Design an enzyme around this catalytic site. Structure first.
Site, mmCIF file in Angstrom:
data_model
loop_
_atom_site.group_PDB
_atom_site.id
_atom_site.type_symbol
_atom_site.label_atom_id
_atom_site.label_comp_id
_atom_site.label_asym_id
_atom_site.label_seq_id
_atom_site.Cartn_x
_atom_site.Cartn_y
_atom_site.Cartn_z
ATOM 1 N N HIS A 69 0.831 -1.215 0.000
ATOM 2 C CA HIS A 69 0.000 0.000 0.000
ATOM 3 C C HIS A 69 0.858 1.255 0.000
ATOM 4 O O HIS A 69 0.829 2.070 0.953
ATOM 5 C CB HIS A 69 -0.875 -0.089 1.238
ATOM 6 C CG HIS A 69 -2.051 -0.962 1.041
ATOM 7 N ND1 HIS A 69 -2.170 -2.182 1.695
ATOM 8 C CD2 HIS A 69 -3.147 -0.809 0.272
ATOM 9 C CE1 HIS A 69 -3.273 -2.746 1.302
ATOM 10 N NE2 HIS A 69 -3.940 -1.906 0.491
ATOM 11 N N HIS A 73 1.663 1.430 -5.835
ATOM 12 C CA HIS A 73 0.215 1.122 -5.864
ATOM 13 C C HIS A 73 -0.577 2.360 -6.287
ATOM 14 O O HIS A 73 -1.436 2.285 -7.149
ATOM 15 C CB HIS A 73 -0.254 0.672 -4.474
ATOM 16 C CG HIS A 73 -1.707 0.359 -4.378
ATOM 17 N ND1 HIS A 73 -2.320 -0.575 -5.194
ATOM 18 C CD2 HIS A 73 -2.688 0.845 -3.595
ATOM 19 C CE1 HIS A 73 -3.588 -0.704 -4.848
ATOM 20 N NE2 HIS A 73 -3.844 0.142 -3.883
ATOM 21 N N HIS A 107 -5.730 7.541 -3.120
ATOM 22 C CA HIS A 107 -6.825 6.736 -2.520
ATOM 23 C C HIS A 107 -6.327 5.960 -1.307
ATOM 24 O O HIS A 107 -7.158 5.467 -0.522
ATOM 25 C CB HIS A 107 -7.507 5.844 -3.530
ATOM 26 C CG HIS A 107 -6.757 4.573 -3.785
ATOM 27 N ND1 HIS A 107 -5.627 4.547 -4.535
ATOM 28 C CD2 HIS A 107 -6.971 3.288 -3.361
ATOM 29 C CE1 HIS A 107 -5.099 3.323 -4.500
ATOM 30 N NE2 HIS A 107 -5.928 2.512 -3.817
ATOM 31 N N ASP A 108 -5.048 5.729 -1.194
ATOM 32 C CA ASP A 108 -4.497 4.996 -0.023
ATOM 33 C C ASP A 108 -3.485 5.862 0.752
ATOM 34 O O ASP A 108 -2.622 5.316 1.445
ATOM 35 C CB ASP A 108 -3.911 3.682 -0.502
ATOM 36 C CG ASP A 108 -4.883 2.517 -0.468
ATOM 37 O OD1 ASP A 108 -5.847 2.483 0.355
ATOM 38 O OD2 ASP A 108 -4.658 1.621 -1.272
ATOM 39 N N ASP A 218 -8.357 -0.435 -8.265
ATOM 40 C CA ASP A 218 -7.758 -0.875 -6.996
ATOM 41 C C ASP A 218 -7.305 -2.326 -7.049
ATOM 42 O O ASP A 218 -6.320 -2.638 -6.397
ATOM 43 C CB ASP A 218 -8.754 -0.703 -5.869
ATOM 44 C CG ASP A 218 -8.080 -0.596 -4.526
ATOM 45 O OD1 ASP A 218 -6.812 -0.414 -4.441
ATOM 46 O OD2 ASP A 218 -8.816 -0.721 -3.619
ATOM 47 N N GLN A 270 -6.278 -17.174 -3.138
ATOM 48 C CA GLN A 270 -6.365 -16.355 -4.377
ATOM 49 C C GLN A 270 -7.571 -16.818 -5.208
ATOM 50 O O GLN A 270 -8.360 -15.940 -5.656
ATOM 51 C CB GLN A 270 -5.002 -16.330 -5.083
ATOM 52 C CG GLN A 270 -3.954 -15.483 -4.334
ATOM 53 C CD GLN A 270 -4.433 -14.041 -4.323
ATOM 54 O OE1 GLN A 270 -4.551 -13.404 -5.379
ATOM 55 N NE2 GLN A 270 -4.812 -13.538 -3.144
HETATM 56 C C1 LIG Z 1 -13.019 -10.230 0.844
HETATM 57 C C2 LIG Z 1 -11.740 -9.655 1.115
HETATM 58 C C3 LIG Z 1 -10.584 -10.464 0.995
HETATM 59 C C4 LIG Z 1 -10.741 -11.854 0.606
HETATM 60 C C5 LIG Z 1 -9.579 -12.655 0.437
HETATM 61 C C6 LIG Z 1 -8.265 -11.895 0.720
HETATM 62 N N1 LIG Z 1 -7.446 -11.217 -0.397
HETATM 63 N N2 LIG Z 1 -6.502 -11.812 -1.293
HETATM 64 N N3 LIG Z 1 -6.024 -10.963 -2.161
HETATM 65 C C7 LIG Z 1 -6.577 -9.751 -1.867
HETATM 66 C C8 LIG Z 1 -6.460 -8.450 -2.489
HETATM 67 N N4 LIG Z 1 -5.618 -8.434 -3.632
HETATM 68 C C9 LIG Z 1 -5.965 -7.531 -4.698
HETATM 69 C C10 LIG Z 1 -4.478 -7.215 -4.954
HETATM 70 C C11 LIG Z 1 -3.591 -8.389 -5.468
HETATM 71 C C12 LIG Z 1 -3.929 -9.749 -4.853
HETATM 72 C C13 LIG Z 1 -5.344 -9.748 -4.299
HETATM 73 N N5 LIG Z 1 -7.119 -7.351 -1.938
HETATM 74 C C14 LIG Z 1 -7.861 -7.522 -0.823
HETATM 75 N N6 LIG Z 1 -8.091 -8.725 -0.207
HETATM 76 C C15 LIG Z 1 -7.477 -9.860 -0.730
HETATM 77 C C16 LIG Z 1 -9.649 -13.999 0.065
HETATM 78 C C17 LIG Z 1 -10.964 -14.563 -0.197
HETATM 79 C C18 LIG Z 1 -12.150 -13.833 -0.089
HETATM 80 C C19 LIG Z 1 -12.053 -12.449 0.280
HETATM 81 C C20 LIG Z 1 -13.173 -11.584 0.449
HETATM 82 MG MG LIG Z 2 -7.376 1.104 0.503
HETATM 83 ZN ZN LIG Z 3 -5.580 0.693 -2.979
#
Ligand SMILES: c1ccc2c(Cn3nnc4c(N5CCCCC5)ncnc43)cccc2c1
Ligand SMILES: [Mg+2]
Ligand SMILES: [Zn+2]
Length: 314
Positions: A69, A73, A107-108, A218, A270
């Site tokens: 973050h 990003h 945004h962050d 995002d 993932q």
């Molecule tokens: C809601 C929130 C998180 C969840 C997760 C966690 N998780 N895994 N990756 C991310 C993520 N990035 C975007 C950037 C690159 C990689 C993925 N951004 C936020 N949360 C994440 C796993 C399963 C269900 C979920 C539901």
């Molecule tokens: Mg944020």
């Molecule tokens: Zn962000």
């Protein structure tokens, strides 16, 4: 003057137009990349160059050296917005083009590499000031702060009205980056689109669609070339595991996503994330804004890469 086009080397001038552009490892190039994008997205006119540069540098100063973050990003999320705006030129207002790239860069702002949940369990003062969308209200607040520094008001040319409209677009845009809000937002956009009620002339409907764009920029690390996607996923887990560590320090078992002893479970997490969040985001986004289809296709390619990782095929 205003006869001062920014330009990029040939490979960048061409690839920057594509959704899957990576801004690269040269930190010092990212500012100029941003300005390039504003100038093409908006005009050489929309911002006084000297003010822009002073703002961009102060925004950069106010991103921290967290693994994910961070300023990279910031500029990555601005670039995906730039790709969407340039593939949907005629759908957006003058004010929307100005405010959305700025929302994305900001945004962050001043993120500490911890979720709103952690702030709440730690009992951080920001949790008391802002009960929901905790960091997101902080980031909006930090943006308004930097706008108020001498020589930083890039919106100075706007009328009193324009000014409040652009600052209201940024605030909603930044609030929308709170993924807790994404789920309901996309579910309503999905029903609006499918019952044909969606109407881009309804400000309430625009608001939702800009929110979805915000989520889609995002998350755009799921839309890159596999080697970018994979190495960025490492960065986000480094924050998640440190947070897991801090949860443990407050006496809380973290979820396994955040438990660095449950690293084995990344690939299946993932999958869940691509299925629960990303694929549905870019799906609804492609339905509303057909030229954004390459983000969906790239996301689906990356999902399939993560399935290969589970099958031991890498
Ligand atoms: C809601 C929130 C998180 C969840 C997760 C966690 N998780 N895994 N990756 C991310 C993520 N990035 C975007 C950037 C690159 C990689 C993925 N951004 C936020 N949360 C994440 C796993 C399963 C269900 C979920 C539901
Ligand atoms: Mg944020
Ligand atoms: Zn962000």
């Amino acid at each position: 003057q205003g006869l001062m086009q920014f330009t990029l080397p040939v490979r960048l001038c061409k690839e920057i137009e594509l959704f899957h552009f990576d801004i690269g490892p040269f930190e010092n190039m990212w500012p100029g990349i941003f300005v390039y994008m504003v100038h093409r997205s908006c005009g050489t006119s929309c911002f006084e160059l000297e003010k822009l540069c002073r703002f961009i540098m102060s925004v950069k100063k106010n991103y921290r050296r967290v693994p994910y973050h961070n300023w990279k990003h910031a500029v990555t999320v601005a670039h995906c917005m730039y790709a969407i705006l340039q593939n949907n030129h005629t759908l957006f207002t003058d004010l929307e083009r100005k405010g959305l790239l700025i929302a994305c860069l900001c945004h962050d702002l001043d993120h500490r590499g911890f979720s709103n949940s952690y702030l709440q369990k730690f009992d951080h003062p920001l949790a008391a000031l802002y009960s929901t969308s905790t960091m997101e209200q902080h980031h909006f607040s930090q943006t308004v702060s930097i706008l108020q520094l001498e020589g930083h008001n890039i919106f100075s040319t706007l009328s009193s009205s324009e000014y409040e409209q652009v600052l209201e677009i940024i605030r909603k845009a930044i609030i929308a980056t709170d993924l807790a809000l994404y789920f309901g937002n996309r579910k309503q956009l999905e029903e609006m689109y499918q019952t044909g009620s969606l109407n881009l002339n309804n400000q309430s409907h625009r608001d939702r669609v800009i929110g979805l764009m915000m989520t889609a920029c995002d998350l755009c690390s799921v839309t890159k070339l596999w080697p970018v996607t994979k190495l960025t996923a490492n960065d986000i887990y480094a924050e998640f595991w440190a947070e897991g560590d801090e949860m443990k320090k407050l006496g809380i078992q973290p979820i396994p996503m955040m438990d660095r002893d449950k690293k084995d479970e990344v690939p299946q997490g993932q999958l869940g994330f691509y299925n629960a969040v990303a694929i549905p985001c870019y799906t609804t986004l492609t339905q509303i804004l057909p030229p954004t289809e390459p983000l969906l296709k790239a996301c689906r390619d990356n999902l399939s890469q993560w399935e290969k990782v589970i099958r031991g095929e890498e």
